[PDB]
């Protein structure tokens, strides 16, 4: 019985560990999206076509 209840809180615990990993992973998607936007935009500015104002 001690073991049986132990797995009862263990499945709850491992799910909690999953939830915190995917909450981080949710914000992980946005930060990489921001990085892609910066890189594509910096590639645009690498030309000499745009003046200093651009």
């Amino acid at each position: 019985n001690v073991q049986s209840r132990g797995l009862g809180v263990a499945v709850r615990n491992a799910n909690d560990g999953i939830s915190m990993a995917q909450t981080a992973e949710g914000a992980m998607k946005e930060t990489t999206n921001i990085l892609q936007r910066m890189r594509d935009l910096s590639l645009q500015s690498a030309n000499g076509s745009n003046s200093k104002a651009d």
Binding site: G26, A27, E30, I34, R37, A53
Partner: protein, 54 residues
């Protein structure tokens, strides 16, 4: 040095017109610069929606 703006922009002689075209370019550059700043603000929060949604 005389301070002039778009409100004080007067074109009744040919010389005034040459001042006006330069003045309008300064005003347009300022407007475009703040348009870009608002655009950056728009491009910040649109990533904030789906971030907070995640």
């Amino acid at each position: 040095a005389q301070d002039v703006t778009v409100d004080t922009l007067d074109v009744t002689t040919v010389g005034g017109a040459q001042e006006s075209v330069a003045i309008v370019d300064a005003a347009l550059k300022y407007v475009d610069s703040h348009r870009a700043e608002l655009g950056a603000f728009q491009n910040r929060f649109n990533h904030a929606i789906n971030n907070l949604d995640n």
